[PDB]
Design a protein around this nucleic acid. Sequence first.
DNA 1: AGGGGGGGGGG
DNA 2: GGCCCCCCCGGC
DNA 3: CCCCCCCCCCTTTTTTCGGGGGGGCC
Lengths: 332, 352, 258, 330
Amino acid sequence: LAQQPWVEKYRPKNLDEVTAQDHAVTVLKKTLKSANLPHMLFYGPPGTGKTSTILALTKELYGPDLMKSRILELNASDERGISIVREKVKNFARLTVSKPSKHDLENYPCPPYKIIILDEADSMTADAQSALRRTMETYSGVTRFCLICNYVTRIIDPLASRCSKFRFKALDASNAIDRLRFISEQENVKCDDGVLERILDISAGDLRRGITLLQSASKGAQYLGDGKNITSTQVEELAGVVPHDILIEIVEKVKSGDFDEIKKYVNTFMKSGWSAASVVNQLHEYYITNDNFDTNFKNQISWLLFTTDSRLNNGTNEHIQLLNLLVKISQL
Amino acid sequence: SLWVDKYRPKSLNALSHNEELTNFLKSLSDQPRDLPHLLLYGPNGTGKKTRCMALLESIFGPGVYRLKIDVRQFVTASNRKLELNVVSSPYHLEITPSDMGNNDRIVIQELLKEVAQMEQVDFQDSKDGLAHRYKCVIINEANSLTKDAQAALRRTMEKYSKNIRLIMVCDSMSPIIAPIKSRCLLIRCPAPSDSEISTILSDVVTNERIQLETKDILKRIAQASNGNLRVSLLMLESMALNNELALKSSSPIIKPDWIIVIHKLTRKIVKERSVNSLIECRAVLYDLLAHCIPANIILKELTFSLLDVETLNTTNKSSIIEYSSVFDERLSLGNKAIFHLEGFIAKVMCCL
Amino acid sequence: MLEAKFEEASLFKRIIDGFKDCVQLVNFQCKEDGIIAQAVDDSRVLLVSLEIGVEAFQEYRCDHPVTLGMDLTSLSKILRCGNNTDTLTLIADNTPDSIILLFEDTKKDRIAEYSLKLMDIDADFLKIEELQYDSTLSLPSSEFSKIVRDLSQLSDSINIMITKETIKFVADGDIGSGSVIIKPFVDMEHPETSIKLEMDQPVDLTFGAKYLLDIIKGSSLSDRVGIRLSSEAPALFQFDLKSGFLQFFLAPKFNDEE
Amino acid sequence: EKRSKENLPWVEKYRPETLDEVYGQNEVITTVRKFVDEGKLPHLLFYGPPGTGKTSTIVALAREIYGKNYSNMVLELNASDDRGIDVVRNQIKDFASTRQIFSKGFKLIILDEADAMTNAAQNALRRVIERYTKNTRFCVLANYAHKLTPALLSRCTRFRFQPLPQEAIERRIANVLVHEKLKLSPNAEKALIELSNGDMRRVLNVLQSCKATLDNPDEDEISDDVIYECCGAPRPSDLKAVLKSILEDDWGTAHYTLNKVRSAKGLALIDLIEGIVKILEDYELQNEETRVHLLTKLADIEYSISKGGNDQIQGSAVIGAIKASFENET
DNA sequence: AGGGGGGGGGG
DNA sequence: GGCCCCCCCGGC
DNA sequence: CCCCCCCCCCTTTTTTCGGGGGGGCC
Ligand SMILES: Nc1ncnc2c1ncn2[C@@H]1O[C@H](COP(=O)(O)OP(=O)(O)OP(O)(O)=S)[C@@H](O)[C@H]1O
Ligand SMILES: Nc1ncnc2c1ncn2[C@@H]1O[C@H](COP(=O)(O)OP(=O)(O)OP(O)(O)=S)[C@@H](O)[C@H]1O
Ligand SMILES: Nc1nc2c(ncn2[C@@H]2O[C@H](COP(=O)(O)OP(=O)(O)O)[C@@H](O)[C@H]2O)c(=O)[nH]1
Ligand SMILES: [Mg+2]
Ligand SMILES: [Mg+2]
């Protein structure tokens, strides 16, 4: 509706709206007529369409009437301790399947099992996870398990072995452009050539972020009230991308090599609010793609950037990390 | 009331800096029905909370500024009764779950879902008595939340999208997890320029009848604030109160006590490098930490004061910054702040 | 300047006990007509309204309307130490920082008068303008207890449906589902166990286990309840007093599937 | 179950029912058969990695010993159930100290996944095991031996379940193909074994996915391309090309080749790193520190990837680490 | 390690 | 007899 | 009463789930 965000408004409803996950969507569709759906483990980067995919599968399998009575969904917002897993999940799995109505049996396949969707399974403790090993196996004939996670390493080996793994690929401009273009036409958003491709490139495998950026750009254009097409500079500004001029000044200061000047420039730069991750990514792109540096310089800078990114991913101060990275690069 | 609080703007049209951000906020508030979740990030003391309040006032009526404080009771797995101070408004809600430490997740799993799972009674500006809109919840200092709370929020912000909207203000996005960033609309709030800070200070002075011979006075305050506006206003007020409401060209810049203590520590470490000096630094660190001074701020200020020493060379500064970078991550992954501050100080003294 | 000599102090004790859990800080406006109060729940989801008329009090008089934000928990603390049959009065003065509760009795020995502190609670111009509510009825409270306590163990929803000649309580959960239907039933020898019901349009609204359980905890106040359900307005649960009543506007839960 | 067994997943549909259907554990199977054929059945400790067939083996042994009505004559306790000090004290002791109900026989207790049990329960079970040994026997199934107390280990005869050999997996695959009327190319079989890592559950899951992927299983043969598409794993040719470009080509072309290979089929960086590690493990390096640097840097990169982060930076780091490590060869 | 305290030997 | 609540280990 | 060996004994509390024990209401 008009009172919902575009990310939720254009959420897939069926399995035919999934764009770049055909390798698993085809298997899921075949399971509709095969009726032998196994335990599933959906893993991949954020914003790839895993929860949407499982919701669409459950809808197409059961119907809006049987969805409530055949699906049990537990996520990180509910207590999922060992006791909860041993009591509630066990009781639901061991229960008999709800009796479908003639309407549902006529218009839906109505598979003879229920589904438990453990979203954000990577947040569950190992002890709690170990309690499901026999639960899934014993009641496989009446219940099926769907574990959705972002880090596959957080799932214990027995559960990964029991579940069938499904990897969701990143959504880039080469496979997710069609959906973004369709959304743009539906919303009557006018954009210049390459704007959607730039949005998808900035998103880096996150269609939700791209949709949010498109919505923000459309809102800005509507508020402007000029009718001009959306450009790429405005999109970059809305995405927090550092201007190329600032990057040029940064690399020139690094090439200068003076510690005091670099420190002063970093102090001035950090007052603008630019995210450290974006700066590091832009610096990595510029330095790696440049042909004016030798093999050793790139060899060292790659490791330096990797270390800086790893340290930043732990939630540290951006100023200190950025200053250290720039100082190290200047001494390469 | 303090000048920093008495002259706070209460509307989007009253903002005096970052006009582009004001235009973006106005564009967002033009059609607030489809407003996505918002995440404001930028330097501290720039006006992120003021801009959020202005946006809320643009969306709802002026009645967003009538605030109340209530107390909420929570129970943990050990039957431990915890109290949370909730700041509420008829049109919006404000919460700071970090005040409960590792128990912040409970607030996500008990309070927010209570508000988002069902409707509200709106007997004002309505005909039926039931609300026909969404509620905006402001989670202050989202970067301080634990990973579990953010993971719990992941589905909460999605399955109640059109009933509740979240506006999260933070000074850094590094602690924020990728799923939360993906689910939020990023808004960058740059710090005000020196000229804008000087103009605001001049307006305050001329509205408070404060004698000022040269405007350059205010300019210095801006160079002493490093982009912060709240610090600038507080420093102006303190200087006016310390100089009989008359600023002079010879008036010194008033620094807070903790900054002076950190400077003493820095110029004691530089001058003396010994185990006894390290013990005295341990005592100083205990004194600093016992009085509600965050460890990260102490480390940052100590590092940036060491790098400002005119006697140290490039190699010493590089070693100091490398050690600071390592020990910042050590602090982020540790509990005892002094256990890492002492290590950083010892490494710095060794490298000198 | 103001007195509210009660016919029975237990009546006021039950009146206060009926909504102590829902709200704790409520403004009482004491006009010559009687006592009026309306407090918004701290979550801005439940409105506790209440009014006691001049008829209920044994002897009520006032010279100037006054609003007192006096606490409820302290009210219970004061009233719990009292006897059963008495004639509580609420005397005060021109500038009251405290209100003297005169626990008078027919006998001159069983007197337990106390003093209750007053506290400044802000009050707003809340409105309860009537709406064309689809259904409204009244039925005893023992059935409410036997139904709510029964259905709470099976689910967290006490969904109420009001159809012609039918009143349905529905509660579904993990263990199963439970539905209880009550219908117009009048006993000539025992009129108290009767339902007085009038509906205009069908209504169905899902309500919560904790809210109704708390409400029925305080249902000892009135032996009869009052249901009022609409289609777009907050349905209200009322407890009839001697001359007034105690209303509870509770917002219905949001429906995601519809 | 519901309806028929055809609706069950292949992992559960093909669960062995008898002992002769367990493959890859010939020594253990023969030993248990001999034990149960002449009455000398000691306490058993089946230690092994996931997907080896310990639970299936013990279930088949119980069925052979007791028969069809084996579920009512054995006490099966697993991590899904509550196994505390009180449970061991009361229920297990009563089961071990009481005669059979349905028919004459000895008492069997199967503590599956006992590695998730508390130390107090393990200590309590010692005297229960050593006191009712005449009429009761204990079987414990484990994946990690460090979670079991030494006292418990001393009282059980240890049997280790090795990863499934190649021939056993081929035989099971042939049986599954015969049952499902499916055809598999030899290269597809080799790829399946290579990616299987000795787990039969992976074999069954990947085979079911491949069957679902086929346009028409009646007259379509699964090839290596189908397996790679279903699992999304990189092809060996892509790994070889990426390694060649990294080793000999310059930075720009190596980066371009890696990006093109990853974007052609949406490959993941961790699988590429794993394949490169497998390929380089067979390289006859002339120096040791080169291998040390390779291993350390690749482990660091894998650990960083496990926690997320920027993928492009991680790939550049992989390339730089490989180049720097091979620079030491000279 | 530093300081206080109890008990046998000298005084 | 059953909840409900409080204190205390946790590696080999 | 006062002094000198010979040794002994004291210098002291905060903590994230899950399980166990033992006391108190009822
Ligand atoms: N394959 C997709 N096809 C179409 N839209 C998608 C797709 N993936 C994501 N989106 C869009 O982005 C929005 C969010 O998708 P999600 O289902 O939340 O991704 P996700 O994989 O569940 O993210 P995580 O791992 O739980 S943080 C959807 O409502 C869609 O509008
Ligand atoms: N030796 C085997 N022969 C045939 N199939 C096997 C064999 N081992 C495992 N499988 C197959 O994989 C499925 C699961 O085997 P399991 O008995 O559950 O392995 P497991 O050793 O008990 O796993 P863990 O250690 O409890 S995680 C079986 O139903 C079989 O279909
Ligand atoms: N005149 C003026 N003052 C502002 C403005 N924005 C912020 N301020 C002042 O700066 C003070 C601190 O801003 P604050 O909201 O605390 O920033 P935050 O803590 O980073 O979110 C405020 O109390 C205001 O007095 C503005 O736009 N115009
Ligand atoms: Mg999701
Ligand atoms: Mg098993």
